[PDB]
Symmetry: D2
Amino acid sequence: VDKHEVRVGELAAGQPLSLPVYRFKGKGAGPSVYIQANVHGAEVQGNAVIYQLMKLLEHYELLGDISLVPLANPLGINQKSGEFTLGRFDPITGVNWNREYLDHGFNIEVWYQEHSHLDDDTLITAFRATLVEECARRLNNPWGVTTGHRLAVTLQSMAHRADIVLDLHTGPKSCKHLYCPEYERSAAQYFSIPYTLLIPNSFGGAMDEAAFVPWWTLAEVASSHGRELGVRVSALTLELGSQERIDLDDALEDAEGILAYLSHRGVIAETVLPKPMKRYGCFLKNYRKFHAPKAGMVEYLGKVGVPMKATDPLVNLLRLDLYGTGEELTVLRLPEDGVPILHFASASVHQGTELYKVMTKVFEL
Amino acid sequence: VDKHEVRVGELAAGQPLSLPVYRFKGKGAGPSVYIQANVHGAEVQGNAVIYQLMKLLEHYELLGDISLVPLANPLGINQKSGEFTLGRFDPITGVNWNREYLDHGFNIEVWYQEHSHLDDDTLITAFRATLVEECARRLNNPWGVTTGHRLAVTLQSMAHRADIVLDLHTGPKSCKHLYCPEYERSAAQYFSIPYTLLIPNSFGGAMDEAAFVPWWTLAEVASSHGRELGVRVSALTLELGSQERIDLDDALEDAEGILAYLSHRGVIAETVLPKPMKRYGCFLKNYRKFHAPKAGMVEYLGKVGVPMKATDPLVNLLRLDLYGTGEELTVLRLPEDGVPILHFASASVHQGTELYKVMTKVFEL
Amino acid sequence: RVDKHEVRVGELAAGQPLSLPVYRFKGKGAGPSVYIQANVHGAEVQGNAVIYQLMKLLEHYELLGDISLVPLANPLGINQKSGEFTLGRFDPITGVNWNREYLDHGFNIEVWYQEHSHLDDDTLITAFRATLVEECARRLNNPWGVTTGHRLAVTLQSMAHRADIVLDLHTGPKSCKHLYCPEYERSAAQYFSIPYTLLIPNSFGGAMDEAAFVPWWTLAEVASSHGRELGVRVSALTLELGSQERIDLDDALEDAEGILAYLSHRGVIAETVLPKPMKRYGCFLKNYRKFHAPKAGMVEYLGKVGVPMKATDPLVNLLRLDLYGTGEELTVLRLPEDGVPILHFASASVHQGTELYKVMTKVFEL
Amino acid sequence: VDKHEVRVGELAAGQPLSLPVYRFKGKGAGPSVYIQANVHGAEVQGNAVIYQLMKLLEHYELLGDISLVPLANPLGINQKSGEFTLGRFDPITGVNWNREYLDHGFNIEVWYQEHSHLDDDTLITAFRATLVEECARRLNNPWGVTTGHRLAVTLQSMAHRADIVLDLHTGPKSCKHLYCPEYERSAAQYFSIPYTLLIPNSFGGAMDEAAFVPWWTLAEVASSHGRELGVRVSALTLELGSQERIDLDDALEDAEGILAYLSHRGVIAETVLPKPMKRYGCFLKNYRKFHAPKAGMVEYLGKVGVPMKATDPLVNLLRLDLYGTGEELTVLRLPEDGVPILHFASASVHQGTELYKVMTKVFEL
């Protein structure tokens, strides 16, 4: 396993901020893969998944290149506030690190017309080069870029080089879930993840969108001019359970599912079949946020990853300040049938604190 | 002066979160005004400006109603982290409190068509009622709304009721500046603020935009159908110097400038002239952010509100870890001529930390 | 039945007062008085659930002594968030632990004793209590003022000083149920439903229990040095009821049932409530050890809280993706001595020196 | 100037925590010196002081060794919360980095009796070796030590090796002041510092105390057996103005004061005279903390380092929530005549927030 380090920033006291990049060289015509974990500092299980995946890959026949970037945001990973990693956003500005990726601005209609005389492979190579160069340009600005933008664009440049991008995250108190763009709903069949969110061709600041939107858009533009190029990049986001947790056995299960997808895509020569299990989904627009309608102390009743019906108890809300009044213990209920995916990591909420995220209008994939 | 209290939230231990609303009734046909301060918790000087304005208003003849909401975000105001106020964003999620306002989704073209028969005043009354009603609809949701969204929508509902909205902020280490929509560039000459950013018809989550975007879009639609309605609301954001400070004399000067605008608008009967001083403008697109190109300890040389040249030293960057190498003390310079408006409030930066914001292509108003 | 009053403990910059709800059940008898508080550490919310369940139960018992309960005892800490966690343990401005702000009475107890020794036991005790209550008032009446945390602690303390029994309800981070019990009342552990007890000495270290018992224990010592037996006339125990950032009403019922056994034992309630049968272990406080990370990294916790282990047992796996391909990629850290891990760090990522576990060593059955 | 790095810790993502140690070798018999800065993360001016000192030291004739340790707490230096450095205490535990030093437990009376047959220099050498070894023993513990304790003891071990220890800090919003032990009141005359706190032989967790307490106790014990050994180490703490600030020219003034002390002690051969200026002192017991008696917004009126009377206004307390009542704006005053040294860095306080520290019963040195 070839390893190098990639510089992503620098701290006030002088210390460089760098990432370890592990590379497995493929011997064949299989697709290239880029995997990263822990952009969100508290979401550490992704590192254990990378560890297990690399241990497994050491016994497979790699047909395509694989690059793996654990510990992808040291500034967030190393940031504590109390006994909790404050790792989700820049502590100075509040900007979510996974909202700092680069939306390629250029006109794809024009880019396509200017390259439409090239054959598919040549055109694809040129498009990839244009994205990599756009990242370089962005970082070359004399006014500079934000701390998180430098990190994200640096990761993005590496991701753009691959045919397949897997971004490993975790939820707070959460079940395993997956984000797939609508064009590759089938990907969910190979991972070992029970709930999938199908997402549209829209850039919203995150790595997966940053990676797929240019290619999905190029595919549509090409087809609109009678050329069926196809979407040439896969980019998926795996939300592997809960944050602030390392569970090596569970990480192995996640890694086994990833291998099934890698086998399916021809990255590895061996046939690795998907885990037989039920897989459900919902379209992103039906993924709902449930906010505390009143403040108070919270006992979570809705178990993550378990379907619930409209009006079922989601939490008990306890109010010691209201003892004997009639409202010291109340039940907050789920508005619509759905599956609670994740809940707030703390037991005390203000009015409006996000208590849960719930997939509604869920279907079997 | 009538005092009222408006609830905006509730804390886990049981206390309600509420705001003081001071209302002066006008005796006449003057425009109505809504003024708030301290939505960003550290930006406390706005409270002193409200204090001084109310003290002054007691000696003027009010022709229009004025509502004043100091201490507009107690959750942010009361949030300390070390010896400073962590007041800019929700500490749980990182979302800027001034990015939680509501962009009205309804079709203004259709709305206009359905009300085009009304005269100006009734059409304005109808539109205003619609905006107020949409805020109410937003807060009534079984899935709830964020802590910051409840606060923002509550403030916005009050703001929508006024003809003039003044949002009082401060910068970090900053000179006095003003955000003014392009449709009322004339406003800038009445306030006592040397630098003004002229901003376009675009919603970006903030109060001023929330208040003016619907009316500006309405004006455009009306005009397209041959009706020159005009933009019937004014909404301006005053960035009154630096955060984490109360300066009552300085606040009086700010209040006097506000009074000049209110006099100009016929809110008060008396003639209060603008303070004589030079005033400059800049289109929003030319307001640039300068990020640290390297980490280190900063001596700030560019003074806020003082024009400078690209060749001038902006900061000295000290690196004790590089003593003896030639890199221990380096000078940073801005890529372009301009006027630094504000700079970072700390002397320690990581690579990418936003060091200054700078108005470029400045012109005299 | 229950009377509620509010007690002011501070004020916020924007104007809102900081206040506590104080619930009181009046006793109809000669039983001892009891003062119970919870959630002085903001993240330690289970104590509210314990107070809730206890009050629901108490409504059906016969009270011989007064019981005052103070849930939500620190709204400034309780309401303080940082990320998806309550930054509730210390003043966020200064770092000072809210449970290190209590008042150590400085007056000379030997001299106070000599000046009141002619009094009978009950009159001497009443006088001592009055002195403690007055000393708290004097502390808060200072033109230079006092810290935010000291004002809170001293307000709680003055209430606590009025009772015969003080129960401070806490939680650990990821923790089993444990109890702090002063050496002079080792028997108390036999009544609660708590498997592990730390026996603590006569020493003031800034906390409520110490603040409550040190003056009385010292007074008993002074009286005994003169051949007069007064006894330690106040009981002050700290219950660490599981993990923080959690409300578990069923588990809180169990805790409340144990507290009731102690109250029956002390004659606060008329009814017989016998202790839950279970093995109960203890160790002296000096044998309660802090295990710090020897190296930074990602941690998988192997030592389960409340489960005895040996030195040869794995405490955690330490995972280092930055060291992949070397022997340091994944290592096992082990405890240096046999003991019982009580609690561990609430996060999976540690720096060198981060406190990984607290472990009772030299444990014995009580 | 020789430079080496000293390991003090390690972060979660794997990065080492190290300090740059700059060493100037002495040639002769002059006392040795240990200088450190920025143990408290926000107190960055000490770095500028060290930078100036090192530039100056390259031209002086050194008779004793000098070690300088700027950037002495990278974990605290690099920690941000909003636009400020949360650098005073461990963000996990709240423990002040400058309360983590080691109080040597060993019986000095016994130690002295076991070495009383040794002459002064042999005894001094042995006592120093004992202190250094106790630090090593502390760090060699299978149960480990806290993050802050490892740092503090590492710094302390280096400090113990020197004859003169200078710990460079800053206050929040503060004038320049000095902590000087009662046994060397004469040292204060040399520094360029107007206000000095004379401190007793008491260990409170801080570097200076950690460095001097053993030697001061040893002097007491020696003297009690008819041997006037004297206190063989000098340990002073300079609070060099305000935090979150780099001012190079002002740092130069501080460095020159330091060099006057060093010249006075014979560390450098050249005569560097102290700056003429009035110098005052105060015994530590008379340094008082003034806390907010009520919450609110604060305008600081008491200027740091300027004597005041109990009848003078210290702050205006502004309460917008109490407008229209006598409590809308009130004046808080100093209970006793004194010199305000430092005040709170923010303008919004809760009841009990420490507003000022004030030296009372001040005398000219």
